[PDB]
Design an enzyme around this catalytic site. Structure first.
Site, PDB file in Angstrom:
ATOM      1  N   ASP A 129       0.851  -1.132  -0.199  1.00 33.47           N
ATOM      2  CA  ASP A 129      -0.536  -0.295   0.352  1.00 33.47           C
ATOM      3  C   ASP A 129       0.591   1.287   0.108  1.00 33.47           C
ATOM      4  OD1 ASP A 129      -2.794   0.965  -0.376  1.00 33.47           O
ATOM      5  OD2 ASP A 129      -3.072   1.123   1.317  1.00 33.47           O
ATOM      6  N   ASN A 134       0.178   7.643   2.051  1.00 34.35           N
ATOM      7  CA  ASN A 134       0.750   7.323   3.419  1.00 34.35           C
ATOM      8  C   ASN A 134       2.076   7.258   3.284  1.00 34.35           C
ATOM      9  OD1 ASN A 134      -1.511   5.280   4.026  1.00 34.35           O
ATOM     10  ND2 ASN A 134      -0.268   3.796   3.039  1.00 34.35           N
TER      11      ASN A 134
HETATM   12  O1  C74 Z   1      -3.595   3.924   9.036  1.00 31.70           O
HETATM   13  S1  C74 Z   1      -2.414   4.677  10.429  1.00 31.70           S
HETATM   14  O2  C74 Z   1      -1.511   4.719  10.636  1.00 31.70           O
HETATM   15  O3  C74 Z   1      -2.466   6.234  10.466  1.00 31.70           O
HETATM   16  C1  C74 Z   1      -1.702   6.798   9.778  1.00 31.70           C
HETATM   17  C2  C74 Z   1      -1.647   6.878   8.503  1.00 31.70           C
HETATM   18  C3  C74 Z   1      -1.338   7.544   7.848  1.00 31.70           C
HETATM   19  C4  C74 Z   1      -0.370   8.591   8.246  1.00 31.70           C
HETATM   20  C5  C74 Z   1      -0.004   9.268  10.265  1.00 31.70           C
HETATM   21  C6  C74 Z   1       1.199   9.159   9.928  1.00 31.70           C
HETATM   22  C7  C74 Z   1       1.577   9.473  11.439  1.00 31.70           C
HETATM   23  N1  C74 Z   1       2.424  10.371  12.155  1.00 31.70           N
HETATM   24  C8  C74 Z   1       1.661  11.894  11.303  1.00 31.70           C
HETATM   25  N2  C74 Z   1       1.912  12.945  11.880  1.00 31.70           N
HETATM   26  C9  C74 Z   1       1.740  13.940  11.287  1.00 31.70           C
HETATM   27  N3  C74 Z   1      -0.003  13.876  10.557  1.00 31.70           N
HETATM   28  C10 C74 Z   1      -0.115  12.310  10.466  1.00 31.70           C
HETATM   29  N4  C74 Z   1      -1.299  11.986   9.243  1.00 31.70           N
HETATM   30  C11 C74 Z   1      -1.118  12.861   7.822  1.00 31.70           C
HETATM   31  C12 C74 Z   1      -2.591  13.528   7.837  1.00 31.70           C
HETATM   32  O4  C74 Z   1      -3.682  12.037   7.985  1.00 31.70           O
HETATM   33  C13 C74 Z   1      -3.637  11.750   9.271  1.00 31.70           C
HETATM   34  C14 C74 Z   1      -2.145  10.636   9.360  1.00 31.70           C
HETATM   35  C15 C74 Z   1       1.105  11.204  10.569  1.00 31.70           C
HETATM   36  C16 C74 Z   1      -0.871   8.190  10.273  1.00 31.70           C
END
Ligand code: C74
Length: 254
Positions: A129, A134
């Site tokens: 993915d 991501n």
């Molecule tokens: O599926 S889970 O691991 O959830 C996730 C999926 C991808 C990134 C994610 C993370 C991790 N650290 C982060 N710092 C700042 N924004 C983030 N973001 C971007 C905006 O959208 C929400 C996450 C983010 C969490």
């Protein structure tokens, strides 16, 4: 060992599955990311074990271009993941703002991506993915792979899925080499190479590998992409040669 009591929640970072919030470990004053997952979604989607899978895979996975998972915990109604905070947000957001990326940025991102994937493949872990939303950016513009939901050790948008996966066949580590070609395309063009208004259309465009290059794409770039975007997985180059591709070596940073 963990509880919401230990954290002060803050700004909403983003994201169905559950939202991600900026937070702070109270005793450490360490700032991180906290994703709240409602077990209700875990039930109806039957992702009750898939989480328990990835949370083991990622937790003991350490690489600069891989977003770290520090730990996890759960209450009555929700599940929480304690992730590394990426200050410069997603690459998807960056791509929206700048429409297209230059070759230095693209080759640099691709380089940092390949290095992180090799490591994953070393522990025999496949991601699949690998998508712009991501991919996060650290303080130094560091690319950082996130979300290991479908990560394993051997349906939404199909844009980044390889032919062998969308046809149901057997998929190895060559899957990520496909995605790597898709990204390099989108990083350079601003759109995925197989885009369509239809799941069914994208399905055919992927399965028949129907992608065309706009004029502003370097032949050095047209090479790598068309080499990574091949129907037969065995023909997809190794991660080493990607990092050793002249176009990469030329435009990538140090
Ligand atoms: O599926 S889970 O691991 O959830 C996730 C999926 C991808 C990134 C994610 C993370 C991790 N650290 C982060 N710092 C700042 N924004 C983030 N973001 C971007 C905006 O959208 C929400 C996450 C983010 C969490």
């Amino acid at each position: 060992q963990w509880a919401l009591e230990d954290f002060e929640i803050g700004r909403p970072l983003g994201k169905k599955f559950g939202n991600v919030y900026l937070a702070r470990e109270k005793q450490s004053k360490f700032i991180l990311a906290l994703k709240v997952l409602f077990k209700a979604q875990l039930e109806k989607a039957g992702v009750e074990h898939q989480l328990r899978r990835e949370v083991e895979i990622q937790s003991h996975l350490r690489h600069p271009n891989i977003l770290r998972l520090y730990g996890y915990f759960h209450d009555a109604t929700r599940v929480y993941l304690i992730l590394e905070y990426a200050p410069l947000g997603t690459v998807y957001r960056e791509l929206q703002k700048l429409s297209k990326f230059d070759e230095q940025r693209t080759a640099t991102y691709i380089t940092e991506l390949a290095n992180a994937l090799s490591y994953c493949h070393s522990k025999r872990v496949i991601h699949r993915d690998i998508k712009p939303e991501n991919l996060l950016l650290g303080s130094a513009g560091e690319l950082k792979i996130a979300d290991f939901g479908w990560s394993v050790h051997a349906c939404g948008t199909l844009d980044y899925l390889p032919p062998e996966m969308i046809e149901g066949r057997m998929h190895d580590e060559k899957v990520d080499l496909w995605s790597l070609g898709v990204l390099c395309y989108e990083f350079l063009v601003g759109k995925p190479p197989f885009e369509a208004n239809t799941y069914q259309e994208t399905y055919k465009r992927i399965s028949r590998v129907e992608f065309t290059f706009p004029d502003f794409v370097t032949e050095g770039a047209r090479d790598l992409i068309s080499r990574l975007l091949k129907h037969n997985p065995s023909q997809r180059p190794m991660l080493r040669e990607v990092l050793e591709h002249p176009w990469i070596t030329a435009n990538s940073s140090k």
